[PDB]
Amino acid sequence: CPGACVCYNEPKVTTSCPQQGLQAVPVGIPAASQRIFLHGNRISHVPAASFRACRNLTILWLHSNVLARIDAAAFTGLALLEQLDLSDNAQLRSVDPATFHGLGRLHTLHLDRCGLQELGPGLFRGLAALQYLYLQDNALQALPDDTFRDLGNLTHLFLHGNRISSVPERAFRGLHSLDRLLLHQNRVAHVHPHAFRDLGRLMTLYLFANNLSALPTEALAPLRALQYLRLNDNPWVCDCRARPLWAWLQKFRGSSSEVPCSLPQRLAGRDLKRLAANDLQGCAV
């Protein structure tokens, strides 16, 4: 086994060379390795077919490594790959759309704390098996249509800490079985109704800290079975336009947060969840 690593077959075959100051992926990683650990090094690249001979690789960790570019090939024969953590590489900024193409059995994929500015075309094409998909704290500006379409088992989608400015119909389409997506700490101005139009089964949604003035009507409608909704820290305007949300909150059985009206004044500071129906004026004008 390569130096600066410990190798064992014990539970599953591991290579493990974490925090060993490695500058690049060592050449001698034994092929019949099941799980490989390379986080905490200084590996700045994942060149084409870096783990090819490891046909039985289940777990692979490269997080916290000053990654800069990950060859479109990279994970090529890692068909049995389950977890692939590339988190904490604020210098990556991007992943060639065809990168994860194979990765069928992929269960969990971490791409958080990465300079990801955009989510390319088929970045997540047919990742079917995927359930956990971490994408918090990147530079993502928008969620383009059908971006998570093929992700049918996805039950955990984290997108907070980005720069998403709005949620269009397209995004979150095939996301059936999605149990909880967080969108907090984003710049969400508008949430197109129907945007959650098959986002049922969803257990918990987060939209706090987001620059939302008021939510459309049919917006929270599909969220039958929702149990946790966090809407604090938003410029909630409270005029007749808030009725739909006001209403949706009253009939809500689950657990909500505080929806602080931050406008108009005179009502400013009060929480929409406790305003009486006729507190919302300034109608059709």
Are the beta carbons of 193 and 216 closer than 8 angstroms?
A: yes
Q: Give the one residue of 31, 48, 49, 247 binding ligand NAG; rule: CB under 6 A.
A: 31
Phi first, then psi, for residue 249 (nearest 5°) are -75, -40
Site string for ligand NAG, 32-51 (x = CB under 6 A): x-------------------
Binding-site size, ligand NAG (CB under 6 A):
4
* Nearest residue (CB) to ligand NDG, 127 versus 207: 127
- State yes or no: residue 129 binds ligand NDG (CB under 6 A): yes
- Return the one option of ligand NDG, ligand NAG, none that residue 153 interacts with (CB less than 5 to 8 A, by type): ligand NDG
Are the beta carbons of 60 and 83 closer than 8 angstroms?
A: yes
Query: Residue 266: CB partners within 8 Å, gap ≥ 6?
Result: none
Q: Closest approach of Cβ 103 to ligand NDG, in Å? A: 12
- Return the one option of ligand NDG, ligand NAG, none that residue 56 interacts with (CB less than 5 to 8 A, by type): ligand NAG
Are the beta carbons of 230 and 208 closer than 8 angstroms?
A: yes
Are the beta carbons of 195 and 218 closer than 8 angstroms?
A: no
- Return the one option of ligand NAG, ligand NDG, none that residue 247 interacts with (CB less than 5 to 8 A, by type): none
- State yes or no: residue 153 binds ligand NDG (CB under 6 A): yes
Q: Closest approach of Cβ 58 to ligand NAG, in Å? A: 10
Going 91 to 97 to 102 to 104, the CA torsion angle's sign is positive
What residues form DSSP beta bridges with 32? none
Query: Residue 236: CB partners within 8 Å, gap ≥ 6?
Result: 212, 213, 214, 242, 259, 260, 261, 262, 263, 272
Place of tokens 């909630």: 236
- State yes or no: residue 8 binds ligand NAG (CB under 6 A): no
- State yes or no: residue 141 binds ligand NAG (CB under 6 A): no
Q: Which parts of this chain interact with ligand NAG (CB under 6 A)?
A: 31-32, 55-56
Q: Which parts of this chain interact with ligand NDG (CB under 6 A)?
A: 128-129, 153
